[PDB]
């Protein structure tokens, strides 16, 4: 189902695409996995810990 | 000289200041 969903859009069915380095500017070999995962932010901020 | 002070490091803006005064003592201007 996820593969078909990727195929629905322009994104590849493999789920991982080629990324170019921010500084060097040439693409990373072995295309890396990207996506929009829901990640939180815990209340253990560094401001409290100093 | 025992006035309440903001702790060092923490900052921000005051959103509201609520004052509770016991009956008998006259309340100040802000109260």
């Amino acid at each position: 189902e996820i593969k078909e969903l990727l195929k629905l859009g322009d994104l590849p069915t493999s789920g991982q695409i080629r990324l170019y380095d921010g500084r060097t500017g040439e693409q990373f070999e072995r295309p890396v996995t990207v996506g929009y995962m829901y990640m939180l932010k815990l209340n253990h901020l560094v401001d409290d810990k100093m | 000289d025992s006035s309440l002070r903001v702790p060092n490091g923490v900052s921000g803006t005051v959103i509201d200041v609520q004052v509770f005064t016991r009956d008998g003592v006259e309340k100040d201007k802000r109260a």
């Binding site: 921010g22 500084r23 040439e26 | 900052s11 803006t13």
Partner: protein, 221 residues
């Protein structure tokens, strides 16, 4: 060697265009594209809002009656509007709206030079019949991102994080050119994405001036 030129500027949309540089050889294409992209994304002079004063709102977290959302969401929407100025480095925008209806950027009482490039950008929605919001938006030019907590007076002044960055997505592609008779020549096309406050041609030219001046640290003209 060969000199890249502004062979074409494909203004595909109102916000983002597609600039083309034609003459480049092995390496130059990727090198110059990456350098231009890094210069553009790093330091491009924008004109984002940096300071807002509301007519009757004491602080950033309060709420006035008649407005759809909080003042904080109003400030965050204000940060999103794209505004460009021509003459003045500093300008104050006054927004006066009354009655039911969304408060888009089109109703800002702009001056002669300052103009809103996205008038449809909504700021807040007025809901009550006798609901009026009067804000004095302070917009100034700047480079890069500087938050309101790392800068430098009245209690009624509200600080919004500065977002001086006209460009949001710079993508370049290096592909072979179509010169009259030659090989090993590539054209650099940059798919720069802007909020509308900067002309892609002048943005590319200014980024290249910054890069060239940064190279003058040990090289004479």
């Amino acid at each position: 060697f060969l000199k890249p030129r502004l062979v074409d500027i494909e203004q595909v949309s109102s916000t983002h265009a597609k600039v083309t540089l034609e003459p480049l050889e092995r390496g130059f294409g990727h090198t110059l594209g990456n350098a231009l992209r890094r210069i553009l994304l790093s330091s491009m002079p924008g004109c984002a809002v940096t300071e807002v004063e509301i007519d009757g709102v004491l602080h950033e977290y309060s709420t006035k009656e008649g407005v759809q959302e909080d003042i904080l969401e109003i400030l965050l929407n204000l940060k999103g509007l794209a505004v460009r100025v021509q003459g003045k480095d500093e300008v104050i925008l006054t927004l006066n709206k009354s009655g039911i209806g969304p408060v888009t950027a089109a109703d800002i009482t702009h001056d002669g030079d300052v103009e809103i490039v996205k008038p449809q950008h909504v700021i807040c929605h007025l809901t009550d019949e006798n609901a009026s919001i009067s804000m004095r938006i302070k917009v100034q030019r700047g480079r890069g991102y500087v938050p309101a907590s790392t800068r430098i007076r009245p209690i009624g002044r509200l600080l919004v994080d500065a977002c001086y960055s006209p460009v949001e997505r710079i993508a370049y592609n290096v592909e072979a050119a179509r010169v009259e008779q030659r090989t090993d020549l590539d054209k650099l096309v940059i798919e720069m994405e802007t909020n509308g406050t900067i002309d892609p041609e002048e943005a590319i030219r200014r980024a290249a001036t910054i890069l060239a001046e940064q190279l003058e640290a040990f090289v004479d003209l």
